[PDB]
């Protein structure tokens, strides 16, 4: 009809409602993120925890970490047979 | 020359009767003075716009069209429409 403001209508809606939702998820995701792998908390030792944080730790995760249980139970069971048999 | 002078006389005093004297012409029944001078003077406007060509009918230029200075109703609808058009930008 006459003059208007075709571009200035970005007030009524920002570009990309789906991109806006994605970016809003991105802001919460990236902001509420550790600076560089923060909050590790690996070490622990209290009676059994000295074995948990050492033997159930994934630095090795080899076969001996489970085999310690077998060796210990064998130590218990040999005395069990000695007191039993 | 007599044939030149006589021709000039008969073609001048008679030309006087036709034009240089308001005696019209006896040989021709209708005088051109009662025919051309006023009525055929409207022949110029008969070919032109009669009482309108020399007159040049008054036609003042008008105003161009606008929105009637209406931002109470046109502005909001215009804004919504432009934003709707922006949805496919």
Curated annotation (Swiss-Prot), chain A:
Keywords: ATP synthesis, CF(0), Hydrogen ion transport, Ion transport, Membrane, Mitochondrion, Mitochondrion inner membrane, Transit peptide, Transport. GO terms for cellular component: mitochondrial inner membrane; mitochondrion; proton-transporting ATP synthase complex. Signal peptide: none annotated. GO terms for biological process: proton motive force-driven ATP synthesis; proton transmembrane transport. It is found in: Mitochondrion; Mitochondrion inner membrane. The keyword Membrane applies. The keyword Transport applies. It comes from the Eukaryota. Present with 14600 molecules/cell in log phase SD medium. Belongs to the ATPase F chain family. Mitochondrial membrane ATP synthase (F(1)F(0) ATP synthase or Complex V) produces ATP from ADP in the presence of a proton gradient across the membrane which is generated by electron transport complexes of the respiratory chain. F-type ATPases consist of two structural domains, F(1) - containing the extramembraneous catalytic core and F(0) - containing the membrane proton channel, linked together by a central stalk and a peripheral stalk. During catalysis, ATP synthesis in the catalytic domain of F(1) is coupled via a rotary mechanism of the central stalk subunits to proton translocation. F-type ATPases have 2 components, CF(1) - the catalytic core - and CF(0) - the membrane proton channel. In yeast, the dimeric form of ATP synthase consists of 17 polypeptides: alpha, beta, gamma, delta, epsilon, 4 (B), 5 (OSCP), 6 (A), 8, 9 (C), d, E (Tim11), f, g, h, i/j and k. This is ATP synthase subunit f, mitochondrial.
From Swiss-Prot, chain B:
It is found in: Mitochondrion; Mitochondrion inner membrane. Its main location: mitochondrion. GO terms for biological process: cristae formation; mitochondrial proton-transporting ATP synthase complex assembly; proton motive force-driven ATP synthesis; proton transmembrane transport. The chain holds residues 36 to 124 of 124 of the full protein. The keyword Signal does not apply. F-type ATPases have 2 components, CF(1) - the catalytic core - and CF(0) - the membrane proton channel. In yeast, the dimeric form of ATP synthase consists of 17 polypeptides: alpha, beta, gamma, delta, epsilon, 4 (B), 5 (OSCP), 6 (A), 8, 9 (C), d, E (Tim11), f, g, h, i/j and k. Keywords: ATP synthesis, CF(0), Hydrogen ion transport, Ion transport, Membrane, Mitochondrion, Mitochondrion inner membrane, Transit peptide, Transport. Residues 54-89 are annotated as: Disordered. Residues 65-89 have a biased composition (Acidic residues). Present with 6140 molecules/cell in log phase SD medium. The keyword Ion transport applies. Mitochondrial membrane ATP synthase (F(1)F(0) ATP synthase or Complex V) produces ATP from ADP in the presence of a proton gradient across the membrane which is generated by electron transport complexes of the respiratory chain. F-type ATPases consist of two structural domains, F(1) - containing the extramembraneous catalytic core and F(0) - containing the membrane proton channel, linked together by a central stalk and a peripheral stalk. During catalysis, ATP synthesis in the catalytic domain of F(1) is coupled via a rotary mechanism of the central stalk subunits to proton translocation. One of its GO terms (cellular component) is mitochondrion. This is ATP synthase subunit H, mitochondrial. Belongs to the ATPase h subunit family.
């Amino acid at each position: 009809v006459s003059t208007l403001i075709p571009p200035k209508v970005v007030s009524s809606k920002n570009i990309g409602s789906a991109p806006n939702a994605k970016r809003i998820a991105n802001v919460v995701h990236f902001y509420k993120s550790l600076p560089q792998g923060p909050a590790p908390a690996i070490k622990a030792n209290t009676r059994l925890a000295r074995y948990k944080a050492k033997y159930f730790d994934g630095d090795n995760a080899s076969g001996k970490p489970l085999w310690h249980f077998a060796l210990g139970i064998i130590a218990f069971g040999y005395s069990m047979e000695y007191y039993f048999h | 020359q007599d044939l030149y002078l006589r021709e000039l006389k008969d073609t001048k005093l008679a030309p006087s009767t036709l034009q240089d004297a308001e005696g019209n012409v006896k040989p021709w029944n209708p005088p051109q003075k009662p025919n051309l001078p006023e009525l055929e003077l409207q022949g110029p406007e008969a070919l032109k716009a009669y009482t309108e060509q020399n007159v040049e009918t008054a036609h003042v230029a008008k105003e161009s069209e606008e929105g009637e200075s209406e931002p109470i109703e046109e502005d909001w609808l215009v804004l919504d429409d432009a934003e709707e058009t922006k949805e496919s930008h």
